[PDB]
Tab-separated table of C-alpha atoms and ligand atoms in Angstrom:
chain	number	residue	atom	x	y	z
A	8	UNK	CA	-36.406	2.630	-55.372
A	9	UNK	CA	-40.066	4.369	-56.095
A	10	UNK	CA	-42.953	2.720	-54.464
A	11	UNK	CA	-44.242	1.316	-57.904
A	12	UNK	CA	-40.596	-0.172	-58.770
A	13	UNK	CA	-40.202	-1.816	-55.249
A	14	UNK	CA	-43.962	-3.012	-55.367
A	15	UNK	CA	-43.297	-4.821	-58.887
A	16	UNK	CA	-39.645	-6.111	-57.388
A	17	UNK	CA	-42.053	-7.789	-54.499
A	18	UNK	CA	-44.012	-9.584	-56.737
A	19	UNK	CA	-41.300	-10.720	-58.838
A	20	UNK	CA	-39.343	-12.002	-56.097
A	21	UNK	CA	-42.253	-13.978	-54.509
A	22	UNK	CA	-43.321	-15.586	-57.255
A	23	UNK	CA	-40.003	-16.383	-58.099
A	24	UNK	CA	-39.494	-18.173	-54.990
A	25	UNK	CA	-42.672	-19.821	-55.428
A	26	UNK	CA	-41.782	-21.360	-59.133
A	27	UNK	CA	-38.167	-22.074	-57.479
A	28	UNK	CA	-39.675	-24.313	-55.285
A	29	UNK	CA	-42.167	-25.911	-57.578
A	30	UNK	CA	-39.379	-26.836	-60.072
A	31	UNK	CA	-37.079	-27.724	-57.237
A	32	UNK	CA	-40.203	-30.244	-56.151
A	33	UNK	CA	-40.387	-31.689	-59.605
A	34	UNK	CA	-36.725	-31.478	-60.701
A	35	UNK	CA	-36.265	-34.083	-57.216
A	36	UNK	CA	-39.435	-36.329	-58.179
A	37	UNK	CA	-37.863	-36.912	-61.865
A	38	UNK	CA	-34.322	-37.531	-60.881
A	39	UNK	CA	-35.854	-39.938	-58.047
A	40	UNK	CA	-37.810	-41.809	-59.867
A	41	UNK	CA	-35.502	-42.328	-63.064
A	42	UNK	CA	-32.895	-43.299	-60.823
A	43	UNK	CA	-34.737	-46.103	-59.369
A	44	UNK	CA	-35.856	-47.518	-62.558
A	45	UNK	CA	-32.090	-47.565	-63.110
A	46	UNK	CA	-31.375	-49.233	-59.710
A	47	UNK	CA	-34.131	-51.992	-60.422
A	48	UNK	CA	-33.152	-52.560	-64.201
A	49	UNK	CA	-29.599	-52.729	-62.981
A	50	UNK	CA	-30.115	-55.621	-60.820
A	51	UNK	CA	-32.910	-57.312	-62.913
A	52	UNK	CA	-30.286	-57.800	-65.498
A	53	UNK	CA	-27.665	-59.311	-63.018
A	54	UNK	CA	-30.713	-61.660	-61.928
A	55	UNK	CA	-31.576	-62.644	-65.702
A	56	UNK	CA	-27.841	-63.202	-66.391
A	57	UNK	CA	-27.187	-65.301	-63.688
A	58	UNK	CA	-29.978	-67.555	-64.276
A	59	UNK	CA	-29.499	-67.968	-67.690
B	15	UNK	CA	-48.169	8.732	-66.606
B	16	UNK	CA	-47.820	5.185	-68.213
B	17	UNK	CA	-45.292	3.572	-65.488
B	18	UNK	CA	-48.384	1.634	-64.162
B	19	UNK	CA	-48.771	0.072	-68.172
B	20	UNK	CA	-44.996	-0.006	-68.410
B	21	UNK	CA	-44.064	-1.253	-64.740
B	22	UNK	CA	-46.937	-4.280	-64.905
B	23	UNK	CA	-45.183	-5.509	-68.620
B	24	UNK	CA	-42.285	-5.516	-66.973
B	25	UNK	CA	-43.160	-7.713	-64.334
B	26	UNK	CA	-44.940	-10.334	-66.822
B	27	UNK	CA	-41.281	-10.043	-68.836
B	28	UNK	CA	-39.135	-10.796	-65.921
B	29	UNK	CA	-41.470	-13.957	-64.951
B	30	UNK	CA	-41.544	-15.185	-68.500
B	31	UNK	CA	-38.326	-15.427	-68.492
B	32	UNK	CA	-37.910	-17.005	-65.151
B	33	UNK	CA	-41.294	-19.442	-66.132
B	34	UNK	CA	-39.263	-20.309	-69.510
B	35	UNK	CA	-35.940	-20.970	-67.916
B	36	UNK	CA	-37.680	-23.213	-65.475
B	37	UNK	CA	-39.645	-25.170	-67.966
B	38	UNK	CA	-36.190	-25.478	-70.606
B	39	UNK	CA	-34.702	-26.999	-66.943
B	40	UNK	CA	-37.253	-29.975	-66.599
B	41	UNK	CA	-37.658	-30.423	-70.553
B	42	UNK	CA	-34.306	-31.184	-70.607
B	43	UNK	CA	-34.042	-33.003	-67.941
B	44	UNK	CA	-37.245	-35.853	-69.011
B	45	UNK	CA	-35.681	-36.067	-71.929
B	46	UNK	CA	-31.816	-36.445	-70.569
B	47	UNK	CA	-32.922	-39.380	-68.109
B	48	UNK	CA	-36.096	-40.904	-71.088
B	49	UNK	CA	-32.904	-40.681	-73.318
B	50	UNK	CA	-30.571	-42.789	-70.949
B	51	UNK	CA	-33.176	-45.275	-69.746
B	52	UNK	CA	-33.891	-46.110	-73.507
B	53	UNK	CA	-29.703	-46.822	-74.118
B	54	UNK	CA	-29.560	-49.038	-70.797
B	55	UNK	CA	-32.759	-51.084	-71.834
B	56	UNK	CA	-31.048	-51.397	-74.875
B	57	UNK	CA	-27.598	-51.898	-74.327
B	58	UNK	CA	-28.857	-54.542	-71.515
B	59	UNK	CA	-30.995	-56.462	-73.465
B	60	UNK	CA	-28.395	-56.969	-76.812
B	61	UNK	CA	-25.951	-58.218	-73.453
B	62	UNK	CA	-28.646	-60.524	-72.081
B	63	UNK	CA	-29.890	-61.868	-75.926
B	64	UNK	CA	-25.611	-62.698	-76.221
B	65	UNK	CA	-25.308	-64.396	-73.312
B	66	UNK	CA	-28.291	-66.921	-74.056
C	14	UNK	CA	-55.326	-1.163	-60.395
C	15	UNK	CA	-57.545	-3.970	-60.404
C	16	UNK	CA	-57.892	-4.486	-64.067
C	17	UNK	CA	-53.552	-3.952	-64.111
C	18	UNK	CA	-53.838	-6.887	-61.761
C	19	UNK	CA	-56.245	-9.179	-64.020
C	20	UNK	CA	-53.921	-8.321	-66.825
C	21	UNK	CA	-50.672	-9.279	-65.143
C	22	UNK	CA	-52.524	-12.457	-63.881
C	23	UNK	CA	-54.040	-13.420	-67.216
C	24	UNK	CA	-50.885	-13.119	-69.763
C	25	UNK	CA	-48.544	-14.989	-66.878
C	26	UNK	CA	-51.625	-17.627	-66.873
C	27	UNK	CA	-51.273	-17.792	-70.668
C	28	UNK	CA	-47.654	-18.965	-70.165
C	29	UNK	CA	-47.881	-21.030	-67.870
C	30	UNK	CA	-50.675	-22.871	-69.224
C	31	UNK	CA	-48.574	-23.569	-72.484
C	32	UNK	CA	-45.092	-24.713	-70.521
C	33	UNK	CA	-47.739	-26.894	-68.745
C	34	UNK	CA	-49.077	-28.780	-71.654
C	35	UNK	CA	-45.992	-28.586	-73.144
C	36	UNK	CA	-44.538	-30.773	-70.218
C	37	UNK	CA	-47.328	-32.875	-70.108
C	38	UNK	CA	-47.162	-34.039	-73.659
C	39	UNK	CA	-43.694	-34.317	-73.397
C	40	UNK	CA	-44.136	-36.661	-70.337
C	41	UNK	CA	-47.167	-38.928	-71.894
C	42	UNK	CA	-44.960	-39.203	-75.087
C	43	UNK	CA	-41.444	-40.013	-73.603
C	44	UNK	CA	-43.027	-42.920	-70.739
C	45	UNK	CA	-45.261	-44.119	-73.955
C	46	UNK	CA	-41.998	-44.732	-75.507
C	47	UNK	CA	-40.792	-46.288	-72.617
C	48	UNK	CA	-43.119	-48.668	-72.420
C	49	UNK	CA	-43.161	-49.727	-76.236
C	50	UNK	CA	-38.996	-50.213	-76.021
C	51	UNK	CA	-39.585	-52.241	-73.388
C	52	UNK	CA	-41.824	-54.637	-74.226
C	53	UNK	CA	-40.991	-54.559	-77.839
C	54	UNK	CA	-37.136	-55.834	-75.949
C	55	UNK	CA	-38.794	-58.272	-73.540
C	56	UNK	CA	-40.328	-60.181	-76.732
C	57	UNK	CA	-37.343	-60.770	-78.194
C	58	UNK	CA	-36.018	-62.243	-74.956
C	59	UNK	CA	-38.610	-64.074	-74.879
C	60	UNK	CA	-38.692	-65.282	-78.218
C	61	UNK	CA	-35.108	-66.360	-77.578
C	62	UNK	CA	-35.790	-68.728	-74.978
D	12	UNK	CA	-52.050	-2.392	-44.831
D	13	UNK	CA	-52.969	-0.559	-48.065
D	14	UNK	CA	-54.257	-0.751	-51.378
D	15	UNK	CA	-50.524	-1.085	-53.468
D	16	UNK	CA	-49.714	-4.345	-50.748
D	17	UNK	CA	-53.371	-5.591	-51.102
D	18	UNK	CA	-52.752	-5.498	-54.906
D	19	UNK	CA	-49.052	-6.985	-54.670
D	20	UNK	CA	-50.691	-9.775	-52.736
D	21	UNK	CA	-53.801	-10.342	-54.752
D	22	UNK	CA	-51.536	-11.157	-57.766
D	23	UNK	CA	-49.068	-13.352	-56.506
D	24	UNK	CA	-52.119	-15.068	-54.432
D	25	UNK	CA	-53.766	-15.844	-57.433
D	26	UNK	CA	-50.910	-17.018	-59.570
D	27	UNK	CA	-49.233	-18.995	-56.783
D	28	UNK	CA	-52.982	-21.322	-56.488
D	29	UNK	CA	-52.382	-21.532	-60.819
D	30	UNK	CA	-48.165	-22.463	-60.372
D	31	UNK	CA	-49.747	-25.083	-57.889
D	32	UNK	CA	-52.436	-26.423	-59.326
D	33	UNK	CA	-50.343	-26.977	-62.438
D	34	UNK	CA	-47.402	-28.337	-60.255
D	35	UNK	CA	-49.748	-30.944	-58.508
D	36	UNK	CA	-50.984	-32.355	-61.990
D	37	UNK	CA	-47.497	-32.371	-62.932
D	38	UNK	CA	-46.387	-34.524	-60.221
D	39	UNK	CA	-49.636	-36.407	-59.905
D	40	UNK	CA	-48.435	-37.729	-63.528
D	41	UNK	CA	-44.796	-38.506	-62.967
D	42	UNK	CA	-45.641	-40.450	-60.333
D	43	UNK	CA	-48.565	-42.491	-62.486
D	44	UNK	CA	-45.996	-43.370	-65.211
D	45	UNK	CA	-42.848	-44.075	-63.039
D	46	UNK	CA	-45.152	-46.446	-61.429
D	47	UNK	CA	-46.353	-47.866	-64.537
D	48	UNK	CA	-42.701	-48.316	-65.986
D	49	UNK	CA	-42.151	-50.164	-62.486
D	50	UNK	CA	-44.817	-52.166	-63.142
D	51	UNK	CA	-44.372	-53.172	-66.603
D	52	UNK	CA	-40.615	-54.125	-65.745
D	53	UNK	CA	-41.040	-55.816	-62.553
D	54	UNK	CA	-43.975	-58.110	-64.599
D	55	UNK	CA	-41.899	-58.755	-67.960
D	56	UNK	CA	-38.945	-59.543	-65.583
D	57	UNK	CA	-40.630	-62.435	-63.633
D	58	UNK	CA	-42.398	-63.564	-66.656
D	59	UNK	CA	-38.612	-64.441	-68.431
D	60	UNK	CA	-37.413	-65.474	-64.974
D	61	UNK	CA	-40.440	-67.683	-65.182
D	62	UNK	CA	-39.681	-68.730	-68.757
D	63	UNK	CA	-35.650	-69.215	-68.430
E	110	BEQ	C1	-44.357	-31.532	-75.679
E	110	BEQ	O1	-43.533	-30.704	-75.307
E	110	BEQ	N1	-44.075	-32.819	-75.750
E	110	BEQ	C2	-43.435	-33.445	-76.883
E	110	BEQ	C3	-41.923	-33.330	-76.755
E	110	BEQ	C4	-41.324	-33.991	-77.998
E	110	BEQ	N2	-41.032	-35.465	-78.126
E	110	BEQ	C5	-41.370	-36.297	-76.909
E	110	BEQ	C6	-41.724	-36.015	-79.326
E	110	BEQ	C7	-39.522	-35.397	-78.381
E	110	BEQ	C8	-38.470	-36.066	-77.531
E	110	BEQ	O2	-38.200	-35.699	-76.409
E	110	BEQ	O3	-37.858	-37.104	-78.136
């Protein structure tokens, strides 16, 4: 394409990887961490029914 | 001409709708896993108050 | 060019300053939540015996 | 090198440092209430262990 039209492709891309990778980052972080508070609920309830 | 004007709204266009797309992803995502985590805590806890 | 640049910058700063905040508050809200269903939960366990 | 790449790279340069500075509070956060929520849980949990 023209100079200007691959210039402004460039700068989409780029920052489109960079956002990809933020929300990749935080997409990870959330799923980790909810899944652990499901993990440790999970077994504080089997604790707290077995004991009573 | 005006392809500088035209070419640089383009390029906040195609990351606004990357940005938005991004930011949909994660707000649905907190409030998929809040949503789940409440229904566990709660479907636990009527189990455990049952039981004793 | 340069002020093409500061206007690209700006209005994608704009944007991304409002998804921001709009996470944030979503965040703070949701673990507030959280924390009230849970320990609104516990006392009734613990009011049980 | 030339003015059209110095441009290119002058805007994503500055919106990468916003995208990560926004990202970093973002994460700095998750992380402070997950750890909360583990906190609250794991203390609630030993107190009804504790109680019964
Ligand atoms: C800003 O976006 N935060 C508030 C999001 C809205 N709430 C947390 C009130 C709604 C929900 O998820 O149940």
């Amino acid at each position: 394409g023209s100079i200007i039209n691959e210039t402004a492709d460039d700068i989409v891309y780029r920052l489109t990887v960079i956002i990809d990778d933020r929300y990749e980052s935080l997409k990870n972080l959330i799923t980790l961490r909810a899944d652990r508070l499901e993990m440790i609920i999970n077994d504080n309830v089997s604790t707290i029914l077995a004991s009573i």
